[PDB]
Design a protein around this ligand. Structure first.
Ligand SMILES: *[C@@H]1O[C@H](CO[C@@H]2O[C@@H](C)[C@@H](O)[C@@H](O)[C@@H]2O)[C@@H](O)[C@H](O[C@@H]2O[C@H](CO)[C@@H](O[C@@H]3O[C@@H](C)[C@@H](O)[C@@H](O)[C@@H]3O)[C@H](O)[C@H]2NC(C)=O)[C@H]1NC(C)=O
Ligand SMILES: *[C@@H]1O[C@H](CO)[C@@H](O[C@H]2O[C@H](CO)[C@@H](O)[C@H](O)[C@@H]2O)[C@H](O)[C@H]1NC(C)=O
Ligand SMILES: *[C@@H]1O[C@H](CO[C@@H]2O[C@@H](C)[C@@H](O)[C@@H](O)[C@@H]2O)[C@@H](O)[C@H](O)[C@H]1NC(C)=O
Ligand SMILES: *[C@H]1O[C@H](CO)[C@@H](O)[C@H](O)[C@H]1NC(C)=O
Ligand SMILES: NCCc1ccc(O)c(O)c1
Ligand SMILES: NCCc1ccc(O)c(O)c1
Ligand SMILES: NCCc1ccc(O)c(O)c1
Ligand SMILES: NCCc1ccc(O)c(O)c1
Ligand SMILES: [Ca+2]
Ligand SMILES: [Ca+2]
Ligand SMILES: [Ca+2]
Ligand SMILES: [Ca+2]
Ligand SMILES: [Ca+2]
Ligand SMILES: [Ca+2]
Ligand SMILES: [Ca+2]
Lengths: 395, 398, 395, 396
């Protein structure tokens, strides 16, 4: 029902031996994949440069059964020329420094944010400013690039997550919502008018008490804020969408109309009033990392961090723990769910990268550390409370 | 509880009507007169006595407020006149007379709205005198403005038309919609005032919850099968200019919502399947079966009249609908037997009433004790500091 | 083990051509069979007049291998003279207007209720008052006919199900419990004394949330209440029986002693107190239409509407989903299980009529729309949880 | 029994006219006092440089009847030479740029932190690095100055609150705890060994839902974190104390032993474990700004922002709303309680500067905008639940 598609012990790259032979040109243990997204027969894996020895940040893998695919070699996408890291570390608009979590739209495009910053412990290296890319997945040729001005974000330290808002009619009308979990803000990007603005709010911050975890018997505490944003279907009368968002270190979900996020004048306000709302409580130890909204079913899938599971919620039902169901739970393999995406085929994709083991213990490249799963949405929710046909619980 | 005033109180209800009507046999019976309403306008309070039995001289009445409070055993004066409240012995349909009136509503336009069921629910002999009709009375002149007979296509008799909710346009006042709650046939009948048309909605959510229909008030057990009973409207949405209709059944601990954009849609009423238009809001709480509830435009707070808990609770509509995001503002197990009515005036007060209907139906009603109570509470003051206060933030589980 | 016995693409009647040739005397699409019962290797099929062009409401079919028999012609029972429809539409005590679900007892008698009402969309026509019938199945001669008084039920709109309570010794001592899913009541009928009374309770109502269905991708909601009643064997001590009843739109099962249902003075109460009991939750999407109790095995067979299946339960085991088993499931054929009955031969009979396709979509007469199955009870429960010898999954 | 000591319509300085005449030297409405602290008939009033036109940041006022003293002229302390702002805005270790809330100890010294930064709307000007000062109140001569290294704090943007931990025996043994409500951290200062270290923790952050205020009909929302710290009495031997701390936008109080804060090795941890504890919920709309702990009675006094009041709590009774009492409330005068201090004379001092009026509306220099009160602690709590002799209202 939920098949493991890709798994790695460590990450290898399809690059010249010149890069592998060079000193500090490739360290296996430093290469941690932070994203896995699906398109056609291609899965894009990203390796953010949070360490030294990372040949390529944006990569791609060709799917071929049987699953699970063992240690697929990452091919630098779109090309290794772009994923080449300059020794001088100087700004270049035709290079990719660090890419976290890309998203695929209906227009056969790949959207991602190049932070332009390497978060090496000790040496924070800001190579260039953060930029928002779009790639044509049909030609494999970059379509647009937008450098984010200083007035919106300083460095792009926390720009690790993006949400696409594409008009159902015109494919040119696109808005992108970036979650900064470091600076506790939301960067809005107007693709049509090539403008951008930032939103500052208290709800983007964590919950002090809900920031402590214990995974794989490893205790830790994070102060990470807004991390993920999920969009509902357009309102028939208003044409606007409801943005479900939450902080990493939070058991609470919040909502806001895109009418507000698409309003540049609203961003500059010091007080946003009652525009941002509290949805409700997701549940004990129900801290989510990434979540996505399925347009067909109207079901939001949450990547639970502490519970090592993936849950779902039918947006039509009241937001409560008893109106949510766990569709998959794996305490052995799912250490930290680093990514969750919904593809154009009606599948839910989620990933674990065992990042906790690297941070607080030793990671062993003998074990399979990196896992990617997929599950058919309509089939996984069939019997559960997430099925729209199934009524909500009485509690 | 220490800032809620009792305004009116009765042991028995009497009437300022001709002695010819009071003297006549079965023209006035003391124990049969049970008021089901208490609404405030300016300096007077409108009390209704539905003819659920015999000996009911008048249904719609009015009382002038005058200290000291509470006013003991006020005489109910037929409104607008006794000529309209005089029951015909022939029992023929009277298009200019009032048979049975339950729960009136007052709007901002100085009008009084109510529904004349035209039906007397006497135990043993159900008498349908005429068809159900909606009224509008000018409170300045005390003259009836309009009367609309509800077609058979919408309601059969009007047996359960004991609740009304007004939807007046914030801009114009001639544009009016009325939502009537039928707790007997389990439906909502919609009335378009300007176009003088009406239609009905049928839905499963208008029914009761089989398990949540048992009560025990004052040590008197009973069960009711009453459905959709009360509707409360939010402020018009700034973008769509529509409202959210909070509605619940009497025998249910659940609250539901629906956009007035659906209710105002005549073609949508004739559908067999309404789809996801009607949604479940959430669980109000254990033993939290409500009778009548009202929404205060200014604060955005809903006051529920809790039947089993013999109390009145409030809820900020901005906060998620949850037990911990609700507070009890007033509780009185002695006086509040059954909260029969709850209304929100134009003066920023919440009015609620108990009529001890249970003690008449299932036990003995004593005219030696006070059985009927009307209360008033300032909304902004009663919520100040509570979770009902919009300025106060919502709570969480942990 | 479970074999299809009868199946129709449409239903035809063996009656004078004069009736078929008459103006709108027979419309193929309007004739929907609502039941199928087995007695002495005979099958009685009923076609309630919920439309125009329905020659006969009560019919019979002779069983003859091989099975399934394709498109058997319905034979009016007991004769066409009774099933004839009067043009003047006046009440006739010796005629059958509308019959839903007949039942067979151990005393070789056929019980059914003529509603005397035609539920045509546009013109609800009440021909006559509802009447309960008894037929001697050995002589095919009517035995008894009782008109239900207005004090008990008004129109007989929702009298579509009956349960027989015959004394194990005397065949004259008979009580019949009718289920009114429209007015939400239970009509009790005392055969011996020729009296009757009604019961009103909250438990006869539906559950608001549990009324939404989606069969064959067709969404719809029904407000139908108490629909079926099943009687256990007499208690060895008090000789009273447990009446298991449920609403159509509900996942909950209820119980009440027949001592209460047989009690006319208890009928006149406004409050029944603690007399009616909640048995428990049958399961998610486990809304049942008709159910029967098998005296020999003490097993109840439920006709699941949403699951398109037939389940069983051992009454001795605690009423829980884990203590129930699905004995037959057929998403292709079983759209709506319109009837389920337990014959005298130790078989469970169930039927599907594709009613929803008529109401919400269009019914194709080129496909088989009407199905009747039979299954040996002792053999079907052998290796399941419904087997009395097998212990429960949940204490 | 609570008396108003000082009240201003606007702040004026005792400085040469050459400074007040200077271009953008003295803009009245930009001069907002942020602290009023007491010492032997002297009140030290500070005016942080959050805007242009502020002659002196650290000032003093001599107390003399009758009270309340109307529009006292601020006198630069210890002198104008130190408070004078350089026109070239270059770093100078003998200059005071911006001081917020000074604190007085038992050893007759005045502690405060010069942020060295001007938080001017538009262009935040960092003149110099933040420094921790001590002044002898007997000689009015600066005793010590310690520049805080970049390893601990970036600029000193949020260093607006300090808590003194002086050893009961030796006056030379001092620790200072600095609350940074902007970078959400606590800076520890070792005075004896002239070292310093920072602390990061989730509890220093605000509570998202508890950040919205409505004062004087003025709606606003703040994201400010750990803002105040209060110290209990020291253990008779180990001389460790309990540090009661809270964020500005929070209805929760938190505790931590000084044994942890005084531990430099513990500061460099990435996970502090259960060392920082949650005390409990202070009450609805009970967001506190500054609070202090009175050694004698053991009572903490909270400055309530939203309730426009001052509440107390006995540190022996369980931390719960019904175990706390409002000793003073004034919706008219108390707009934003900007500072609260406990003196060596057994009085509680609190102040309101109407900061929100300047921020979100207009400030009238015809109205009294700045207020400073005092109250005898043992007298104000006499009957209340805050009295140690009075029993608690709930067991909790
Ligand atoms: C884009 O957002 C702009 C700023 O945000 C608005 O103002 C806030 C105070 C809130 O009202 C918020 O909901 C709203 O988005 C805004 O320029 C613009 O429209 C605003 O909509 C306001 C809705 O109330 C409305 O405010 C008006 O002005 C303020 C100063 C007060 O006087 C209000 O009583 C008055 O209604 C106004 O249309 C406008 N507000 C402002 C500040 O300009 C919004 N975009 C669109 C298309 O509406
Ligand atoms: C009244 O109800 C009908 C219900 O069918 C609404 O109809 C539909 O609207 C969309 C597009 O407008 C159409 O695809 C479907 O047939 C919907 O059901 C109708 O809009 C509504 N009328 C109004 C304006 O309230
Ligand atoms: C900071 O960076 C220095 C540069 O070192 C080199 O950087 C790149 C080119 C990698 O190849 C790396 O392996 C090289 O060492 C480091 O020498 C220095 O140690 C770094 N400082 C810290 C504190 O991490
Ligand atoms: C505090 O500092 C570290 C952190 O726990 C620890 O090693 C040390 O023992 C503690 N206290 C001291 C200084 O002994
Ligand atoms: N993915 C780890 C990001 C992180 C977590 C906790 C922190 O305190 C922090 O500064 C950064
Ligand atoms: N307030 C009495 C309304 C009521 C309650 C139960 C019933 O069965 C009924 O017909 C009517
Ligand atoms: N099963 C058909 C009977 C039925 C179903 C639903 C209804 O709403 C109704 O009035 C009648
Ligand atoms: N004067 C209070 C400081 C403050 C409050 C809220 C903010 O969002 C902020 O940046 C600064
Ligand atoms: Ca694929
Ligand atoms: Ca962080
Ligand atoms: Ca008045
Ligand atoms: Ca009823
Ligand atoms: Ca047989
Ligand atoms: Ca029905
Ligand atoms: Ca801040």
């Amino acid at each position: 029902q939920v098949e493991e598609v890709l798994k790695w012990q460590q990450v290898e790259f399809d690059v010249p031996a010149s890069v592998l032979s060079a000193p500090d040109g490739y360290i296996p243990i430093n290469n941690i994949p932070m994203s896995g997204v699906h398109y056609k027969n291609r899965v894009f894996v990203t390796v953010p440069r949070r360490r030294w020895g990372i040949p390529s940040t944006l990569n791609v893998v060709e799917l071929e059964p049987p699953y699970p695919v063992t240690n697929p070699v990452l091919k630098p996408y779109p090309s290794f020329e772009l994923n080449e890291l300059r020794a001088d570390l100087q700004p270049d608009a035709n290079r990719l420094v660090t890419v976290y979590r890309p998203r695929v739209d209906r227009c056969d495009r790949l959207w991602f944010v190049d932070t332009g910053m390497m978060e090496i412990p000790g040496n924070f290296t800001v190579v260039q400013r953060p930029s928002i890319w779009s790639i044509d997945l049909k030609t494999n040729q970059p379509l647009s690039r937008y450098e984010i001005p200083q007035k919106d974000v300083e460095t792009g330290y926390g720009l690790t997550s993006i949400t696409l808002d594409v008009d159902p009619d015109d494919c040119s009308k696109v808005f992108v919502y970036i979650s900064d979990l470091q600076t506790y803000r939301m960067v809005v990007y107007d693709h049509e008018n090539q403008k951008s603005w930032r939103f500052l709010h208290n709800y983007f911050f964590l919950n002090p008490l809900e920031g402590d975890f214990n995974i794989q018997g490893i205790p830790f505490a994070w102060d990470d804020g807004i991390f993920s944003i999920a969009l509902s279907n357009p309102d028939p009368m208003t044409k606007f969408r409801t943005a479900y968002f939450h902080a990493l270190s939070s058991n609470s979900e919040f909502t806001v109309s895109t009418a507000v996020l698409r309003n540049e004048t609203a961003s500059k306000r010091g007080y946003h009033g009652d525009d941002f709302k509290l949805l409700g409580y997701r549940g004990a130890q129900s801290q989510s990392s990434i979540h996505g909204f399925h347009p067909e079913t109207g079901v939001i899938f949450f990547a639970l961090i502490q519970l090592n599971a993936v849950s779902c919620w039918d947006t039509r039902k009241p937001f409560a723990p008893q109106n949510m169901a766990i569709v998959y739970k794996n305490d052995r393999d799912i250490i930290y769910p680093n990514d969750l995406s919904i593809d154009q085929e009606g599948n839910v994709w989620f990933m674990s990268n065992s990042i906790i083991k690297l941070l607080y213990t030793q990671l062993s490249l003998e074990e399979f550390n990196f896992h990617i799963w997929r599950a058919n949405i309509k089939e996984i929710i069939k019997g559960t409370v997430c099925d729209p046909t199934v009524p909500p619980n009485v509690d």
